[PDB]
Amino acid sequence: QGMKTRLEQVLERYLNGREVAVWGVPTRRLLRALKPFKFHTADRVDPQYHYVVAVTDDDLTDFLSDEQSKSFQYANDYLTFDDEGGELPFERMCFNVPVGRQTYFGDGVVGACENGYIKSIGQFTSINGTAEIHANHQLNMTFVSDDIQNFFNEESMAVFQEKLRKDPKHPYAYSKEPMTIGSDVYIGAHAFINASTVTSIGDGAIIGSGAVVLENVPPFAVVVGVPARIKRYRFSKEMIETLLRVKWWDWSIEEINENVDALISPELFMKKYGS
Amino acid sequence: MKTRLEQVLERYLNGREVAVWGVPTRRLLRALKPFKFHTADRVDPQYHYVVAVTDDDLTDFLSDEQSKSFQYANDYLTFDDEGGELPFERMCFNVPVGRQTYFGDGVVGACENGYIKSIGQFTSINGTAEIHANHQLNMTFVSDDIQNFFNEESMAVFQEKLRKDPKHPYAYSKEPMTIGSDVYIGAHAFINASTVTSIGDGAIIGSGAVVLENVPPFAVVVGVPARIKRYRFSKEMIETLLRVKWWDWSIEEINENVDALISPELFMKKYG
Amino acid sequence: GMKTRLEQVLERYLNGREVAVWGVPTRRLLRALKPFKFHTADRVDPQYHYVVAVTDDDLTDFLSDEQSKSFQYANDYLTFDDEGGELPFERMCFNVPVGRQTYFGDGVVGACENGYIKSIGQFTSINGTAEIHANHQLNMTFVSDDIQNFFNEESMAVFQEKLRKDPKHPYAYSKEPMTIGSDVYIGAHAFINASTVTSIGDGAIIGSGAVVLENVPPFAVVVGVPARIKRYRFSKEMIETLLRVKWWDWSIEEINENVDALISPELFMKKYGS
Numbered sequence: 001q002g003m004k005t006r007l008e009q010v011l012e013r014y015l016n017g018r019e020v021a022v023w024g025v026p027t028r029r030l031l032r033a034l035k036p037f038k039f040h041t042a043d044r045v046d047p048q049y050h051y052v053v054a055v056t057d058d059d060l061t062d063f064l065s066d067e068q069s070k071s072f073q074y075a076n077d078y079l080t081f082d083d084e085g086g087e088l089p090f091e092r093m094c095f096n097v098p099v100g101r102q103t104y105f106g107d108g109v110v111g112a113c114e115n116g117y118i119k120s121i122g123q124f125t126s127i128n129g130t131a132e133i134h135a136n137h138q139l140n141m142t143f144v145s146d147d148i149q150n151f152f153n154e155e156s157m158a159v160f161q162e163k164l165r166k167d168p169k170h171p172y173a174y175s176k177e178p179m180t181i182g183s184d185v186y187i188g189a190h191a192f193i194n195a196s197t198v199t200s201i202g203d204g205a206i207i208g209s210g211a212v213v214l215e216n217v218p219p220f221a222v223v224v225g226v227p228a229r230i231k232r233y234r235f236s237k238e239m240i241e242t243l244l245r246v247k248w249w250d251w252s253i254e255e256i257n258e259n260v261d262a263l264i265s266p267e268l269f270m271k272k273y274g275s
Numbered sequence: 276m277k278t279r280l281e282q283v284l285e286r287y288l289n290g291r292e293v294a295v296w297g298v299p300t301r302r303l304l305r306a307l308k309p310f311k312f313h314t315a316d317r318v319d320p321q322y323h324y325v326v327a328v329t330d331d332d333l334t335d336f337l338s339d340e341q342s343k344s345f346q347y348a349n350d351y352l353t354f355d356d357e358g359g360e361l362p363f364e365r366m367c368f369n370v371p372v373g374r375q376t377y378f379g380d381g382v383v384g385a386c387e388n389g390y391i392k393s394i395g396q397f398t399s400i401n402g403t404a405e406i407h408a409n410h411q412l413n414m415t416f417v418s419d420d421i422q423n424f425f426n427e428e429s430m431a432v433f434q435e436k437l438r439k440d441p442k443h444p445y446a447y448s449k450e451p452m453t454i455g456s457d458v459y460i461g462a463h464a465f466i467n468a469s470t471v472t473s474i475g476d477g478a479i480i481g482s483g484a485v486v487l488e489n490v491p492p493f494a495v496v497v498g499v500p501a502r503i504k505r506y507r508f509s510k511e512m513i514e515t516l517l518r519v520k521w522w523d524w525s526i527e528e529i530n531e532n533v534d535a536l537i538s539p540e541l542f543m544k545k546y547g
Numbered sequence: 548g549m550k551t552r553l554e555q556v557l558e559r560y561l562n563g564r565e566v567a568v569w570g571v572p573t574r575r576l577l578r579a580l581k582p583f584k585f586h587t588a589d590r591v592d593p594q595y596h597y598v599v600a601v602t603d604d605d606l607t608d609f610l611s612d613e614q615s616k617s618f619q620y621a622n623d624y625l626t627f628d629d630e631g632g633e634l635p636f637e638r639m640c641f642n643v644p645v646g647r648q649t650y651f652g653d654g655v656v657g658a659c660e661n662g663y664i665k666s667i668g669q670f671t672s673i674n675g676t677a678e679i680h681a682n683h684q685l686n687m688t689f690v691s692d693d694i695q696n697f698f699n700e701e702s703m704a705v706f707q708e709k710l711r712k713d714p715k716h717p718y719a720y721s722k723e724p725m726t727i728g729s730d731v732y733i734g735a736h737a738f739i740n741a742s743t744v745t746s747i748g749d750g751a752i753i754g755s756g757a758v759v760l761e762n763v764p765p766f767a768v769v770v771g772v773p774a775r776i777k778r779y780r781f782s783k784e785m786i787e788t789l790l791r792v793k794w795w796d797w798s799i800e801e802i803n804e805n806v807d808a809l810i811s812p813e814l815f816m817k818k819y820g821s
C-alpha cells in the first residue's frame with residue numbers, strides 16, 4: 001500500500017507543528033501523502049506558520065519567483081512533491097533503497113529503485129535527471145517479449161519464471177545482486193547502466209554523458225563511450241586506496257567543515273590521510 | 276481519431292459509469308463525451324470503470340483498498356498512457372498496434388507525425404526511444420520553420436523540392452516504417468524515419484543505438500551508428516518463425532505451445 | 548520580474564480581446580495572466596478572444612475543435628507550457644534573446660534560466676530532448692556539488708574562490724555564456740557542454756546523440772561521443788559568403804523575393820558570391 005514518499009520523510013523531520021501550504025494543483029497522490037498533516041492551498045505564506053510544498057517543478061519555479069519565498073530555506077521550510085530523487089540533508093529511503101546525504105537523481109533512477117535494480121546509492125552523488133537504468137529481457141527463448149506473460153496461465157507462467165531464474169545472463173536482473181552506486185559519484189546526461197550486467201558503480205566513479213555502461217565501474221574510474229570504456233582515473237592508486245579507507249563521504253557536517261581544505265585540495269588530502 | 280481509452284471503453288465499459296480518479300483534463304472530457312462519468316469517490320467494478328488520469332493517479336488507485344477487485348483494462352485504465360500495452364490490437368493515431376505492445380511518448384509522437392505504418396505484436400519499446408526524420412540537407416537553409424514566412428508561391432516551390440529529394444526529408448516520398456512483432460528496442464535508441472522503412476520481426480535494438488537503415492528480421496544491432504552484431508537464430512529457424520507467426524496465435528495457442536515458446540530447440544523440432 | 552513567452556506575445560497581439568483559457572490552469576499561468584482580462588474558455592471567437600492552451604495536450608484538443616477554425620497561431624492562440632516554442636518575432640527566454648522561428652525544449656529553457664546561454668539565433672531548430680549542462684569541478688577531492696549545502700560561510704568562501712580561478716570553468720564560472728547561431732540544427736539527445744563551449748556557429752548541425760565538448764565552427768556537421776566534425780555543409784567560399792550575407796536577418800519580403808537562392812545553394816552563390 002505505497003511506501004513513504006520523500007515529502008513525508010521530510011515533513012516527519014521538519015514540519016515542527018506548522019501547516020503545509022500547497023503551492024500548485026493538489027493531486028490524488030499528494031493528498032494521500034498529506035493525510036497525517038494539517039494542510040491548505042497556499043496564498044500568503046510565512047515560514048513561522050507554514051511549510052511550503054510545491055507540487056511540480058513548474059510550481060516551484062513560480063514559488064521561488066515570489067517575494068514571499070525569500071525567508072524559506074530548502075528542505076527545512078519547503079520542498080517539491082514530484083521530486084522523489086531530490087537531494088536532502090539526511091539519509092533516507094527511496095522505496096527500499098538507502099540513499100545518502102546530498103544525493104540526487106531523476107525519474108529513471110527513481111523507477112530503477114522501484115523495480116529493485118538498485119541496492120543503495122551513496123553520499124554526495126550527483127545523477128543527471130536523464131540517466132537511465134534498466135535490465136535486459138531474456139535472450140535464450142523463442143521470444144524476447146515480457147508482456148506476452150500477461151497471456152500465460154498458471155502453468156505457463158511457472159515454466160517461464162523457472163527458466164528466467166536459471167539464466168546466468170540475469171534477465172530482468174534475476175539471480176543477481178542489485179547494483180550499489182557509490183558515494184561522490186557523477187553520472188552524466190543520457191547515460192545508461194545495464195542492470196542485468198552491472199552490480200557496482202564504485203565510489204568516486206564518473207560516468208560521461210551518453211555513456212552505455214555494461215560492466216562494473218571501478219572506484220574513481222572515468223568511463224565514456226558506447227559501450228563505456230575507462231578513459232582515466234581521477235587519482236593515483238595510492239590515493240584511491242586512501243579515499244576508500246577514510247570515507248570522507250560519511251563524515252559529519254562538523255568534520256566536513258573542519259577539513260574543507262583537504263576536500264578542496266587532493267594534495268593536502270594525501271598529506272593528511274595518505275600516511 | 277479515437278484515444279486508447281475510448282477504444283478500451285467501447286470494448287469493456289459494458290454500461291457502467293466512468294469513475295475519474297484524478298484531475299480531469301480537456302482531452303479526457305472530450306474522450307468521455309459519449310459515456311457517463313463522475314469524479315471517483317467510492318468505486319465498485321460492478322458499477323464503475325476507473326480511469327486514472329495520470330500515471331501517478333494510477334499509483335494512488337492501485338495502492339487503494341478499493342482497487343482490489345478491478346482488473347487491468349477490463350475495469351480500469353490510465354488515460355495518459357497512449358503507448359501502454361493492451362490485450363487486444365488497438366490504434367495509436369490510426370497506426371495499428373499489436374497485443375501486449377508498449378512504447379513511450381516519443382513513439383506516440385512518431386505515430387502522430389505519420390512516421391510509422393504499424394507496430395507488431397508483443398513488441399517492447401523503452402519509453403525513451405526516439406523516432407525522428409531529417410530536415411532537408413540540400414538547401415541553403417536547414418530550418419523548417421522558416422516556412423512560416425513563405426507566401427503561397429514560395430511554399431509551393433519549397434514543398435515541390437522536398438518531394439523530389441531522394442533522401443526523404445521529413446519522411447517525404449517514402450513508406451512509413453513497419454515495426455515488426457517480438458521486437459525489443461532499448462533506452463535512448465534512435466531510429467531515423469527519413470531512411471528506415473522496416474524494423475524486422477524479432478529485431479533487437481540496443482540501448483543507445485542510432486539506427487539509420489533497415490534492421491533485418493531477428494538481427495541484433497548496436498552502436499552509433501547501429502551495426503548487426505549477430506542474429507538471434509539460424510537462417511533456417513528465421514524462415515520457420517516468419518512462416519509460423521506465433522505472434523499471431525490465440526491465447527489458447529500461446530499456452531498450448533508454451534514449451535515451444537520457451538525452448539527454441541523445441542520450436543524448431545515442432546515447426547521446422 | 549522576467550516575462551514569460553506568453554506575456555510577451557499577449558503584449559504584442561492581444562489587441563484588447565479577452566484571454567480564453569483552454570485547459571486546467573497552473574500557478575505559473577495565473578501569475579502570467581495578472582495584467583490581462585481572462586476567463587475559462589467556453590464559446591470562443593478570434594474577434595473577441597485570444598485562446599491560451601495550457602499544455603500541448605490542451606492545444607491538440609483546441610485545434611481539433613470546430614471553434615479553432617479561424618484562429619491563427621501566435622496572433623490568436625498560444626500554448627502557455629511552451630516556453631521554447633517558435634514565434635514570428637524575436638523574444639526573450641529568461642532574459643536570453645531568441646531569434647524568429649527558433650524553437651527548443653525544456654532542457655534549453657533550463658540552460659537559459661541557469662545563465663548558460665548568451666543568445667540563440669534565427670531559424671534555429673533544437674530537438675526537445677537536447678541538453679545543455681556544465682561540468683562539476685574536476686580538480687578537488689570531491690566531484691559533488693551539493694556537498695556545499697553543508698559548507699558554513701568560511702567553507703563556502705574557500706570553495707567558491709577555487710571555482711572562480713579554475714581555468715576549466717566548472718559550473719560555467721569565469722567564461723562567456725555560449726552563443727547559438729542562426730539556421731542551426733540540434734538533434735535528439737544531443738548534449739552541449741557549457742563549461743567548455745562558447746559558440747555553436749551559424750549553420751552548425753549537431754547530430755542526434757552527439758556529445759559536444761568544444762566550439763562547433765559555422766556550417767560544420769558534428770556527430771558521435773565525443774562530437775567530431777563529420778563534414779561542412781558548403782565550400783569555404785560559400786560559408787564566407789553566408790557569414791557576410793546573413794540571410795537569417797532578412798525581412799519576410801526579402802526571404803520571399805530570394806526563395807530561389809534559399810532553396811538552391813548554387814543560386815545563392817551566383818547572386819551573392821563576389
Ligand SMILES: CN[C@@H]1[C@@H](O)[C@@H](O[C@@H]2[C@@H](O)[C@H](O[C@H]3O[C@H](CN)CC[C@H]3N)[C@@H](N)C[C@H]2N)OC[C@]1(C)O
Pocket residue numbers: 057082083086087104105106107126128129130661692693718
Ligand atoms: C526532478 N527535477 C530535477 C530538478 O529539480 C533539477 O535537480 C537539481 C540538479 O539539476 C542540481 O545540479 C545540477 O544543476 C546545478 C545548477 N542548478 C549545477 C550542478 C548540476 N549537476 C542539483 N544540485 C540539485 C537538483 N535538485 O534538475 C534535474 C531534474 C531531474 O529536473
Ligand SMILES: CN[C@@H]1[C@@H](O)[C@@H](O[C@@H]2[C@@H](O)[C@H](O[C@H]3O[C@H](CN)CC[C@H]3N)[C@@H](N)C[C@H]2N)OC[C@]1(C)O
Pocket residue numbers: 115146147172330355356359360377378379380399402
Ligand atoms: C507511460 N508510462 C510508461 C510506464 O507505465 C512504464 O511502462 C511499462 C514498461 O516499463 C514495462 O517493461 C519494462 O519494465 C518491466 C518492469 N516493470 C521489465 C521489462 C521492461 N521492458 C512494460 N512491461 C509495461 C509498460 N506499461 O514505463 C514506461 C513509461 C513510458 O513510463
Ligand SMILES: CN[C@@H]1[C@@H](O)[C@@H](O[C@@H]2[C@@H](O)[C@H](O[C@H]3O[C@H](CN)CC[C@H]3N)[C@@H](N)C[C@H]2N)OC[C@]1(C)O
Pocket residue numbers: 388419420445603628629630632633650651652653672674675676
Ligand atoms: C514543448 N513542446 C514541443 C512541441 O511543441 C513540439 O515542438 C515542435 C517541433 O517538434 C517541430 O519540428 C520537429 O517536428 C516536425 C513535425 N511536427 C518536423 C521537424 C522537426 N524539427 C517544430 N517545427 C515546431 C515545434 N513547436 O515538439 C517538441 C516539444 C518539446 O514537445
Ligand SMILES: [Cl-]
Pocket residue numbers: 057058061657
Ligand atoms: Cl525547470
Ligand SMILES: [Mg+2]
Pocket residue numbers: 523524525
Ligand atoms: Mg491462426
Ligand SMILES: [Mg+2]
Pocket residue numbers: 800
Ligand atoms: Mg519592395
